[PDB]
Amino acid sequence: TGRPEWIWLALGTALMGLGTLYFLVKGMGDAKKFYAITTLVPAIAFTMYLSMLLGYGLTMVPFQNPIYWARYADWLFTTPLLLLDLALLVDADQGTILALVGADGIMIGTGLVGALTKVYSYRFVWWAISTAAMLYILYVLFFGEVASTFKVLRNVTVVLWSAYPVVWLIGSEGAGIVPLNIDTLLFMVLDVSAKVGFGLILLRSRAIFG
Amino acid sequence: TGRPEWIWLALGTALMGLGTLYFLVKGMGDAKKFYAITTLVPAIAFTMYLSMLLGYGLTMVPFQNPIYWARYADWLFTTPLLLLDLALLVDADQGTILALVGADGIMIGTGLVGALTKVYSYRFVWWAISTAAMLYILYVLFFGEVASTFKVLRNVTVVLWSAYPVVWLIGSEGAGIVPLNIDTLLFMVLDVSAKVGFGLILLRSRAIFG
Amino acid sequence: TGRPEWIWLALGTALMGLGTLYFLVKGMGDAKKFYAITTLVPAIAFTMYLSMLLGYGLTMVPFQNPIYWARYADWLFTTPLLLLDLALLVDADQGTILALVGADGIMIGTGLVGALTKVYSYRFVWWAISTAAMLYILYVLFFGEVASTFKVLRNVTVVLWSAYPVVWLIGSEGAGIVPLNIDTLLFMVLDVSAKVGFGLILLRSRAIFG
Ligand SMILES: *C/C=C(C)/C=C/C=C(C)/C=C/C1=C(C)CCCC1(C)C
Ligand SMILES: *C/C=C(C)/C=C/C=C(C)/C=C/C1=C(C)CCCC1(C)C
Ligand SMILES: *C/C=C(C)/C=C/C=C(C)/C=C/C1=C(C)CCCC1(C)C
């Protein structure tokens, strides 16, 4: 298309598409639970990447800046599902799952608001609050066979989720240090790893079984 | 009102209104669970039909085409609740419920996107993806007293849910073969049967009891 | 800011901010569950109050009337969480929780629609329907150590939730008897009490423990 970042968006679409199908066929045939959640994640990401590529999930924000809003719609559902996998994995109580999913909702809802805000400076305010929520989620993940995989995914989550605020911050969504074309690439590479990459470790693992 | 399809919208409102109340009084007095879910469904449909009739749930989409977006808001909640009844009925695991509700969310979210897309051809793309999700839900319903009712509702679901993609496809939302006035009528007749019609079979049945 | 009601919005922000933190530190360290839900509530309210104050959660509605839509986004999540605390407290079945949360969703969704409607008279129609849903929730709360606290919070809920329809009705959202500046103050005072005020009674109580 007429947009440089189309190929990354096309790439995200295919890669997320391929993973859903792969996860879909592997799942035939707790494990069920883990397959259910883990397949939904790239499946949802797949529709939002397609929406971004076709231009539906793109809007213009004055502060006129092109903002792909559709990833927040993605992240609103797929990140709590990712937390649930982890939660599942270690039999998290309902208190902690609730806490996590709530902070997650706050993390993404405020990121969206930051994304769509029309006063430049206020954007970072929302960035920080959202970061605070991320840091709480990461904190819960750390302080409160299976315990081996969990440590893996937890490390993966930490390294991958901590990259998003940075990319948004320096990217076209934030201070505009790095152009849209490049922050779209970074998000795609994070997203494929955080979801497809995350999925294979979990799903290729016997930790998911009773 | 100045719109031909007002009477179908008025009709949906009343019929969905009447059912909520009927379900509401019958429910006094697992069964509770089945009454809770089953009454919410026309209750929600009732507010969205009212919203369409008063014109709040109507918008214009260039590709300028009048689109009733409010039914997606309806379907986003009422179709997963319908799946839950079924799930309930056969003690579905949490894996399968999750799978179903996720594909359902994808089914409606993509339908909405198709509904609001401004490139004609892309609309059908979203139609197909949404159809794919429907076909997966229908597949789960089939392959994985009470077992008698369930077969009934399952047949009902299959016959009624399979009609929606067709009406959207040939209707004013899709190729525009059939005018808005008529696709509004078809959706109303499907909606009343899928919810009120569905509700009576389930609720007049002893399968709902322990 | 240039808006009279900024100070109430600033006040809501701080007070809701302070409560989240307070609840956050107290929670370290069923109880977990009660802390999880109860801290999320002002935490969410905190972001929406901030959004209103910075102007993101404010819009203009013709019928041109300034409408703070962001509180519905707040109430959509925080009021069902408040109901859940109560539900928790008395071991409500899943049927009743579902019923309550569904009517709650209807209560707020219709209030929002009323809030955004462009035909003056229709607004009250949506007001009434939303009120009907409130009255059903209040009805469930009444007709179907711990039983002592519960009665307290239930009384509190009843007195505080019943005030919202009145303020909306006479306020700038409704008939415009009382100016925006004043209905913003009333909502803030209700919100802080319904959430922070509600939280302390519950959280300072041993009813939350096994
Ligand atoms: C499947 C997609 C994933 C795992 C996305 C995760 C995204 C985040 C951890 C988001 C973080 C952000 C902040 C904490 C600050 C504001 C910018 C965000 C929303 C990118
Ligand atoms: C209470 C309302 C019900 C049962 C509605 C169900 C609607 C569907 C099964 C929707 C299907 C659609 C597709 C699968 C393709 C795109 C068009 C839709 C959204 C009508
Ligand atoms: C944390 C905020 C709370 C407890 C808000 C509760 C708000 C309501 C009980 C809302 C009620 C309303 C009606 C029943 C009629 C229409 C106007 C509303 C939405 C304010």
Triad A28, A32, A34: Cα angle to 5°: 115
Which tokens sit at B54? Answer: 């008063």
Q: How is residue B173 annotated by DSSP?
A: T
Cβ-based contacts of C74 with chain A (< 8 Å): none
Range of the domain at B181: 1-210
Pocket test for ligand 3, best of C75, C83, C84, C139 (most atoms within 8 A of CB): C75
Residue A56 to residues B117, B119, B123, C156, C194: CA-CA distances in angstroms?
Answer: 7, 9, 11, 45, 39
CA distance A207 to C95: 34
Ligand 2 proximity of B117 Cβ (cutoff 6 Å): no
Triad C203, C208, C210: Cα angle to 5°: 150
CA distance B132 to B138: 10
CA-wise closest residue to A81 among A201, A198, A210, A205: A198
Cβ-based contacts of A102 with chain C (< 8 Å): 36, 40, 43-44
CA-wise closest residue to A34 among A73, A79, A76, A87: A87
Asked if A33 lies within 8 A of B95 by C-beta distance, the reply is: yes
CB atoms within 10 A of CB A61: 15
Which tokens sit at C160? Answer: 């505080």
Neighbours of chain A (3+ CB pairs under 8 A): B, C
Query: Residue A108 C-alpha to ligand 1 middle, in angstroms?
Result: 7
Nearest to A35 among B95, B117, B125 (CB): B95
Backbone phi and psi for residue A177, each to the nearest 5 degrees, phi listed first:
-70, -40
**Helix or strand (DSSP H, E) at B155:** helix B146-161
Counting the structural domains of chain A, the total is 1
Q: At how many degrees (to 10) do helices B180-191 and B31-54 cross?
A: 160
Asked if B109 lies within 8 A of A47 by C-beta distance, the reply is: yes
CA distance C82 to C99: 14
Long-range contacts of C142-151 (CB under 8 A, 24+ apart): C144/C96, C145/C206, C145/C207, C146/C89, C146/C90, C146/C207, C147/C90, C148/C207, C149/C89, C149/C201, C149/C202, C149/C205, C149/C207, C150/C86, C150/C89, C150/C90, C150/C207
Q: How is residue B129 annotated by DSSP?
A: H
Ligand 2 proximity of B75 Cβ (cutoff 6 Å): yes
Query: Residue B80 C-alpha to ligand 2 middle, in angstroms?
Result: 11
Helix (H, G, I), strand (E, B) or coil at B58: strand
Q: How many CA atoms lie within 13 A of A72 on its CB side?
A: 21
How far apart are the two ends of chain C, measured CA to CA in Å?
48
Backbone phi and psi for residue C133, each to the nearest 5 degrees, phi listed first:
-65, -40
CA distance C141 to C144: 6
HEC profile for chain C?
CCCCCHHHHHHHHHHHHHHHHHHHHHCCCCHHHHHHHHHHHHHHHHHHHHHHHHCCCEEEECCCEEEECHHHHHHHHHHHHHHHHHHHHCCCCHHHHHHHHHHHHHHHHHHHHHHHCCCHHHHHHHHHHHHHHHHHHHHHHHHCCHHHHHHHHHHHHHHHHCHHHHHHHHCCCCCCCCCHHHHHHHHHHHHHHHHHHHHHHHHCCHHHCC
Q: Is C93 exposed, middle or buried (0-12, 13-18, 19+ CB in 10 A)?
A: middle
Cβ(C83)–Cβ(C93) below 8 Å: no
Query: Residue A45 C-alpha to ligand 1 middle, in angstroms?
Result: 14
Return left, alpha or beta for C167; rule: phi > 0 is left, psi -120 to 50 is alpha, else beta: alpha
Q: Is A2 exposed, middle or buried (0-12, 13-18, 19+ CB in 10 A)?
A: exposed
Q: How is residue B119 annotated by DSSP?
A: S
Q: At how many degrees (to 10) do helices A31-54 and B94-116 cross?
A: 10
Ligand 3 proximity of C130 Cβ (cutoff 6 Å): yes
Beta bridge partners of B67: B59
CA distance A171 to B184: 45
- Sign for the CA dihedral angle at A50, A55, A60, A66 comes to positive
Nearest to B33 among C94, C119, C122 (CB): C94
CA A50 to chain centre: 16
Which residues of A touch chain B, with CB atoms under 8 Å apart?
31-33, 35-37, 39-40, 43-44, 47, 50-51, 54-56, 77
How many residues comprise chain B? 210
Triad C49, A120, A190: Cα angle to 5°: 90
CA distance C114 to C173: 9
Q: Across chain B, where does the E strand assignment appear?
A: 58-61, 65-68
Query: Chain B residue with minimal CA distance to C100?
Result: B36
HEC profile for A97-122?
HHHHHHHHHHHHHHHHHHHHCCCHHH
CA-wise closest residue to A107 among A82, A90, A87: A82
CA-wise closest residue to C43 among A104, A118, A72, A141: A104
Residue B149 to residues A189, B85, B154, B160, C28: CA-CA distances in angstroms?
Answer: 48, 11, 8, 16, 49
Beta bridge partners of B59: B67
Cβ(B96)–Cβ(B87) below 8 Å: yes
How far apart are the two ends of chain A, measured CA to CA in Å?
48
HEC profile for chain A?
CCCCCHHHHHHHHHHHHHHHHHHHHHCCCCHHHHHHHHHHHHHHHHHHHHHHHHCCCEEEECCCEEEECHHHHHHHHHHHHHHHHHHHHCCCCHHHHHHHHHHHHHHHHHHHHHHHCCCHHHHHHHHHHHHHHHHHHHHHHHHCCHHHHHHHHHHHHHHHHCHHHHHHHHCCCCCCCCCHHHHHHHHHHHHHHHHHHHHHHHHCCHHHCC
Beta bridge partners of A60: A66
CA distance B5 to B186: 11
Resolution for this model in angstroms, one decimal place?
A: 2.3
CA-wise closest residue to B16 among B198, B201, B202, B203: B198
CA B4 to chain centre: 22
* Atom from ligand 2 closest to the CA of residue B195: 1
| C129 to chain B, closest Cα gap in Å | 9
HEC profile for C153-199?
HHHHHHHHHCHHHHHHHHCCCCCCCCCHHHHHHHHHHHHHHHHHHHH
Residue B168 to residues A47, A83, B159: CA-CA distances in angstroms?
Answer: 19, 36, 15
Cβ-based contacts of A97 with chain B (< 8 Å): none
CB atoms within 10 A of CB B147: 9
Which tokens sit at C173? Answer: 């959202």
All residues at 6 or more sequence positions from C202 whose CB lies less than 8 Å from its CB, including other chains: C34, C38, C85, C89, C149, C153, C208
Cβ-based contacts of C69 with chain B (< 8 Å): none
Probe site for chain B from C113, C124, C134 (most B CB atoms < 10 A): C113
Cβ-based contacts of A95 with chain C (< 8 Å): 32-33, 35-36
Return left, alpha or beta for A28; rule: phi > 0 is left, psi -120 to 50 is alpha, else beta: beta
Cβ(C127)–Cβ(C168) below 8 Å: yes
Residue C33 to residues A46, C28, C81, C82, C105: CA-CA distances in angstroms?
Answer: 34, 13, 11, 12, 22
Helix (H, G, I), strand (E, B) or coil at B66: strand
All residues at 6 or more sequence positions from B5 whose CB lies less than 8 Å from its CB, including other chains: B180, B181, B184, B185
CA-wise closest residue to C79 among C130, C26, C31: C130
Which residues of A touch chain C, with CB atoms under 8 Å apart?
93-96, 98-99, 102-103, 105-106, 109-110, 113, 116-117, 119, 122, 125, 129
Pocket test for ligand 2, best of B164, B169, B188, B195 (most atoms within 8 A of CB): B164
Q: How is residue B93 annotated by DSSP?
A: -
Ligand 3 proximity of C78 Cβ (cutoff 6 Å): yes
Pocket of ligand 1, beta carbon within 6 A: A 75, 78-79, 82, 107-108, 111, 114, 127, 130-131, 134, 161, 164-165, 168, 191, 194-195
Cβ-based contacts of B122 with chain A (< 8 Å): 54, 56
Probe site for chain C from B26, B38, B47 (most C CB atoms < 10 A): B47
CATH number of the domain that residue C103 is part of = 1.20.1070.10
* A-to-C residue pairs, Cβ atoms closer than 8 angstroms: 44
Which tokens sit at B207? Answer: 């399968």
